[PDB]
C-alpha cells in the first residue's frame, strides 16, 4: 500500500500503520461492556492557526490522537470509525475551485482515499448527514485529562451533533491504552527518529567550540534533522544548557532562550529530539565544552552512566517503574558518597530522600507521538507522594511494547542543596567543604530511548555516552 | 542603556527603541481630543501555550502590539503606560521560590526593571491594587479588527477590571498608526533582518542543486538565519516552490510542505524571511535550478525586473499605492506582448483586467513587527473591488517612514489562464501558440523591502536580483563581484 515519505534517505511509513491502530482500537472497544452496538468513534483533527490576531500562519502539526488514528497531515479534517465493522471515513474540507491560485492543486476525495487508505472520504460540510445515514446508537468522542499537562482533551464537535447521542467518557481511556503499546510499524518509526537525532547529536558534539552560543548548536541540530531526516518539527524545544544552565531543568524556553556563551571548562547538557511524521525522539548528551572531562566532571558523569546502565539492565516485563527510579537514586547516592560529597549510611540517606536533592525529576517517561506520551497514570495507578517519585510520569509496571526514556541525572541546584543543608536529617550526610567545589558545576543527564521486550529492553538510541566515546568524538577522531 | 543582543555578529537593539514607541504613543494620545486626562494604556502580553492537550510546550513568541510597546520576551506579562506622564509599569508573573528547582535563578522585579528600562515593575497578581492606587480616569485597552486576518485583537483583562472604566475603541487606531511609521531605531533592525535574510538567500542560491528536495533549502535558510543572525523564528513559513510549484502562491504549508525534488530546467521561487526580536523581513528570490536562465526564463524574469524597477523609481510620498499596482500590471502586459504571449492593444488588455491573470496578488504590503503589518486599511480607506487590486493589503498613499514590500510577479496559473481563454472579453489577447510553451513554466517573483523616505525610497534588501547577479551567485562568485 501507500507510504508517507519525504524522499532522499527518509523513512517510508506505511499508511497501514494507522489502519492497524484503528483496528486495535476497535478490538479494545468491542470488549468494553458499556460500548453499544452501532457505536461510531468521532475524532476531530487540528485546524490551521495564526499568531494572535495577525494573518501570520503557524506551521500546522496534527493533533496526536487524530494522527495516531489516521496519520492525516492536512488541517481541518474529521475522522470516524464504525466500531462494529472498523470502517473508516475521512472528512476533508471542501475547497472552492478558486483556491488553486494560492494553496495548490485541489485534490479530489478519491485522491485522499488513495493517499490514506481509508474506506471512504466525504466533505466536512456533509458530516452530520453522512453520520445520520449510518443510524448510530451513540457517537464516541474524546474527552479526558492529560496527566502531564492537566489539560482536557478537545472533544469533537460539528454542526448538527446535538441531534446525536454522544458519549465522551468511554473513548479516552481505551485509545490512550492503545497508544501505550507500540506496534512493530510504530517501533520502526521510533528507530528512525532515534537514528536521525543520534546522528544529529554526534554532529553537534563534533561542532561544539568554546565561544559559541548555545543556540548555534540548536540550529545545527534542527538543520541536520530536517535536511537529512525530513524532520520539519522537533519533539520539544531544544535544551542547550552550558555551565550553570546544565543544572536548569527547564532551560531553552523563551525565558531562557539558549543565549549563553559556552565557556572553557563548562559542562554542556544538550537535550534535543527530532520529530518525524508526529513521532518523537528524546535524547540528552552531556559532555565537557572543551572535549576533556576533568576529574570532577568524569566522576559525576560516570555516576549517571552507572545508574543509566543499571536501570536499562534491570528493565523487563513486571518491573515496577518507581523501583527503577529508586535504583537510580541509590546508585547516585553511592557514587556521590564515593566522591566525598556525601558521608554516612546510604540506607539512611535513602530514608531521608536525599537522592531527590540531586535528581528532582522523574527517571523517565512513556514516549510515542508525544514526547511525554499518554497513559502513564490510568485510573487505579496512583502517583507516589515523595520527593522525586512524585515527578514520575508513570507509576506503572513495565510491559512489552512500551517505549520509555531512561534519563537519570545529577545536578547541583542551589535551592535544593540549601534546603537540605538546613535540615538536620539531611545536612549530616553532606560534606560542605567538598560540595562547595561543585557549586555551579551544573549537571549531567544521560537519556536513552528504549522499548520493553519480552525479556528486557531494546536500545533505540545510538550516541556516544562513555567518556572515551565522547572525548574521541569531540577530538575529531574517526569511528 | 541596555540592549537586546544574541552575541557574535547579531544586532544590539537598544531597549530605548521601545521607550521611544511608548513616548510616541503617549504624544499621539495626548493630541487625541477624546482621550481623558489620567488615562492609562493597558496591554496584555502573550501567554505560554502547548500543543493541543499535551504538555509539549510551543516556543513563545510575543504578541506584536505588546512587543512594540515593551519588547518583553517573557510570557504571562502585562504592561501599562500612563498617558499624561508616560510612566511605564511592567507586570511580571509571581513565580514561587520552589520553581528554582526547574527554573534556576527566579529573577527579581528589579532585574526586569533594569532589563527593559521601564519605570516600575510589579507582580501580575497585584495589577488591580496597583492600578487602583494610581486612580486612573479610564483604562485604554486594545480592540480592533486586523484587516489581513479579519481577527479581533485580544483586549486586556484581569480579575478586578470591571471596577474600572474601560474604553476599548480609542487605542487600536492610534497604536496601529504609530506602528505604520517606523522610527530610526526600528529601521536599524529592519536593515539587519534584511541583511541576514539576504545573506541566507545567497547561501541557498549557492547551494541549490538539481535533485535536492525543496525543504533542504528551507532548512539551510533557517539554519543560517538562526546560527548566524540569531533569528530563532522566521517571519512566515518558507515558500520553497520549484517547477510548477513556483506558480503556487501560498506553497509550503502543511498540505504542500516543500517536498518536491528540484529538476533540471525548473524555475525556483524561494520566498523566505528571518525574524529578529519580533521584527520581520520578507524577500523572494527566483532563479533557475541549474544556474542558467533559458531564453524563456530570462524573458519572464526581466519582465518582472522591469516592473520592480519602475515601481521603485516611482515610489515617493504622495504616491497612491494602487497606482503602483496598476503600473506593474501595465508593464507586465506590455512585456508579455513583447514576448509574443499576448497580442493587441495593451490599453484594451488593462481595461479587461488581464494583468490579474498573471499577478493575482497585491503588489506589496506594509511590513514591520508582522510581515503583513497593521494599518493598511484604516477607517475611510476602501478596498478596491477589481481583480488583483482587491488583494492589495493597503490602499493608502505613501508617506515617509512607511516600510513596504515591492513584490511584482508573473505566474502561469492554469486555472486563471483557462478562465481568460473562456472569456470573450479576454481570450483574444492570448496567443496559445506561444502561451502553450509557458504552461507549467511556474512563476517569477522579485520581492524586496524598502523604506519610504522624504523624497523616494531606501533599499533594505541586498540579494542577487538581476539575471547576471543570479547566474554569478550560483556559480559561486563572491558577493563583491560586480557582473
Ligand atoms: Mn529529554
Ligand atoms: Mn525525556
Ligand atoms: Mn514574501
Ligand atoms: Mn510579501
Numbering used by the authors:
A (entry chain A): 6 to 484
B (entry chain B): 6 to 488
From the paper:
Prolidase Deficiency (PD) is an autosomal recessive rare disorder caused by loss or reduction of prolidase enzymatic activity due to variants in the PEPD gene. The PEPD gene encodes the enzyme peptidase D (EC 3.4.13.9), also known as prolidase, which is the only enzyme in humans capable of hydrolysis of dipeptides containing proline (Pro) or hydroxyproline (Hyp) on their C-terminus. Prolidase is particularly important in the degradation of collagens, a family of proteins where proline and hydroxyproline account for up to 22% of the amino acid content. We presented here two high-resolution crystal structures for the p.(Arg470His) variant of human prolidase.
The electron density maps clearly indicated the presence of an imidazol side chain rather than a guanidinum group at amino acid position 470, proving the success of the introduced amino acid substitution. In addition, comparison of structure of hProlArg470His to previously reported structure of hProl using Root Mean Square Deviation of Cα positions approach shows rather small structural differences mainly concentrated around poorly ordered C-termini. The only noticeable difference was the mutated residue. Glu452 is part of the active site and it participates in catalysis by coordinating both manganese ions. In case of hProlArg470His, substitution of Arg by His resulted in lesser number of salt bridges. His470 forms interacted only with Thr289 and Glu453. Based on our analysis we can classify the hProlArg470His variant of human prolidase as “structurally silent” and assume that loss of function of this particular mutant can arise from flexibilization of the active site.
